[PDB]
């Protein structure tokens, strides 16, 4: 039979419909009067969290992060530039808001490592994503069969090197075949053309 989780999932397929639409109208008012990075006791989207790797266990932290919507906040050139480079308004950054949110979340917790993240809506100017973070130095995590891999020294700051879920999709690594020529095994390796 359907799980209780499938219902949280179902509701979030259309966040502006039904009860949740009402719930969002509520919450966002509070979210707006909140910080840039706020630690929360429980994932807003349980199904998503558990699905991304979450666990009701010690050393597991969740945090909502707000980020401005829109293109890049770019400064206009202060020296000579050919027409092609005099651009300012339409320039967008190569990193998506969600990746930006994971990074800000991670700075707040210099000791935790990002395990994954997901969005929890947006208003006309913000964008909120909840970030699952893990404490690599806490046992109960070390001794955990599902997460202990994130304790490896190789995973120190995995987000800043784009080893996150969102990181890898953004990097163009989702496809194993056509179109991932200049993408895999890394952007930098392909002369940065992806």
């Amino acid at each position: 039979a359907r799980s209780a989780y499938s219902y949280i999932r179902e509701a979030w397929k259309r966040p502006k419909e039904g009860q949740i639409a009402e719930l969002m109208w509520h919450r966002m008012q509070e979210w707006r009067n909140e910080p840039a990075v706020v630690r929360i006791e429980r994932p807003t989207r349980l199904d998503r969290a558990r699905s991304l790797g979450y666990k009701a266990k010690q050393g597991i932290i969740v945090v909502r992060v707000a980020i401005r919507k829109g293109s890049s906040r770019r400064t206009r050139f202060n020296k000579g530039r050919r027409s092609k480079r005099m651009m300012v308004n339409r320039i967008t950054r190569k990193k998506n808001i969600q990746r930006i949110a994971e990074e800000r979340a991670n700075r707040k917790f210099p000791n935790l490592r990002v395990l994954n993240s997901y969005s929890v809506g947006e208003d006309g100017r913000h964008k909120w994503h909840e970030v699952i973070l893990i404490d690599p130095d806490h046992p109960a995590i070390k001794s955990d069969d599902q997460l202990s891999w994130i304790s490896r020294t190789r995973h120190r700051l995995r987000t800043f090197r784009g080893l996150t879920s969102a990181g890898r999709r953004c990097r163009g690594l989702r496809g194993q075949g056509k179109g991932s020529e200049k993408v895999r095994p890394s952007l930098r390796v392909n002369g940065a053309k992806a």
């Binding site: 050919r82 027409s83 092609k84 480079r85 005099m86 651009m87 339409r90 320039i91």
Partner: protein
């Protein structure tokens, strides 16, 4: 100069002389779905667009006749080289 709307002449299709009818070629509309159309969209962006930033040139003092010679029998038409003509009026 003036020119007869109809007159006998070689029809390359029937392969024999027939009475053709001359018509000035009317421009056909564009679909906007040609490669060049798609390239203008693909290659235009911030700053100058190279060739797509250029604009339609000038004109010559006199243009060459641009006509279609349609055969009165099989109904098909053929084109011919044109000759400069300040004006071209048909008779009848």
């Amino acid at each position: 100069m003036q020119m007869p709307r109809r007159f006998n002449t070689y029809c390359p299709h029937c392969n024999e002389h027939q009475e053709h009818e001359v018509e000035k070629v009317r421009s056909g509309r564009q679909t906007g779905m040609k490669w060049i159309d798609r390239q203008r969209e693909r290659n235009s962006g911030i700053g100058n667009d190279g060739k797509f930033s250029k604009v339609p040139g000038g004109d010559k003092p006199t243009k060459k006749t641009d006509l279609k010679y349609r055969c009165g029998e099989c109904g098909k038409a053929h084109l011919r080289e044109g000759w400069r003509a300040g004006r071209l009026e048909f008779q009848e």
